[PDB]
Amino acid sequence: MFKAVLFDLDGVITDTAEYHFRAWKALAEEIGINGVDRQFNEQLKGVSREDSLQKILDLADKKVSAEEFKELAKRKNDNYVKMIQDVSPADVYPGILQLLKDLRSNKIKIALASASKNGPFLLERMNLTGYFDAIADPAEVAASKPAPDIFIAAAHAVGVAPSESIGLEDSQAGIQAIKDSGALPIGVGRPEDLGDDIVIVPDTSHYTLEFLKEVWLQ
Ligand SMILES: [Mg+2]
């Protein structure tokens, strides 16, 4: 049986989409750029901060220096961090708490494999820190998803090889990263985004100990 489970944060344990959106919109409003609405915000989901900022600047053909760019990105981040102060245990996705409990009582290791610079903070706010045997520090990895680095680091951090592990993810790039680490991927979402050569569940309520075991057995 698998010895560890490697969790992504956003889209698996929780998300902070309403807060990211609110931060970008506030920044657009502040600098006077029209068009940053819910619909357009879709084009920023999963995109880096710099690339999101550029897409927003592009709505007004607006041109800025390096320092101005850096400052606008900082301001969007400052907004975002203020907004996430209200993350609570109610933000935990369905099934996840029970899953973490079952994993722990069966002595299966639990690690975070997230690019989020606010991972430890967010796990504290949701009261999940005591379940986590480790958190891979995204600052200490050479390359981000779909590079496998972070899943490799997560597995190693809990004393296992990736090949002893299951990875859970909601993004194509994350699925590829788990694949290339050597761990077994189980996605949440749809085959159109994730691929159809991996097991996928519709939502996180389907992530149960019992189910991960059947998947490991096949
Ligand atoms: Mg994700």
UniProtKB/Swiss-Prot annotation:
Swiss-Prot/TrEMBL cofactor(s): Mg(2+)
Result of changing K76A: 100-fold reduction in the conversion of beta-G1P to G6P in the presence of beta-G1,6bisP
Activity control note: Activated by phosphorylation. Competitively inhibited by alpha-D-galactose-1-phosphate.
Transmembrane listed as a keyword: no
Active site: D8, D10
Binding site for Mg(2+): D8, D10, D170
Localization of this protein: Cytoplasm
Top EC group: isomerase
Description of pH dependence: Optimum pH is around 7. Relatively stable in solution within the pH range of 5-9.5.
Pfam families: Hydrolase (PF00702)
Effect seen on changing G46P: 100'000-fold decrease in catalytic efficiency
Keyword DNA-binding carried by entry: no
Consequence the record notes for mutating K45A: 20'000-fold decrease in catalytic efficiency
EC number in record: 5.4.2.6
Recorded superkingdom: Bacteria
Site (Important for catalytic activity and assists the phosphoryl transfer reaction to Asp8 by balancing charge and orienting the reacting groups): S114, K145
Residue numbers of 4-aspartylphosphate PTMs: D8
Result of altering S52A: Wild-type activity
Further information: The catalysis proceeds via a phosphoenzyme formed by reaction of an active-site nucleophile with the cofactor glucose 1,6-diphosphate (G1,6-diP). The phosphorylated mutase binds either G1P or G6P and transfers the phosphoryl group to the C(6)OH or C(1)OH, respectively.
Subunit structure: Monomer.
The protein, known as: Beta-phosphoglucomutase
Provenance organism: Lactococcus lactis subsp. lactis (strain IL1403)
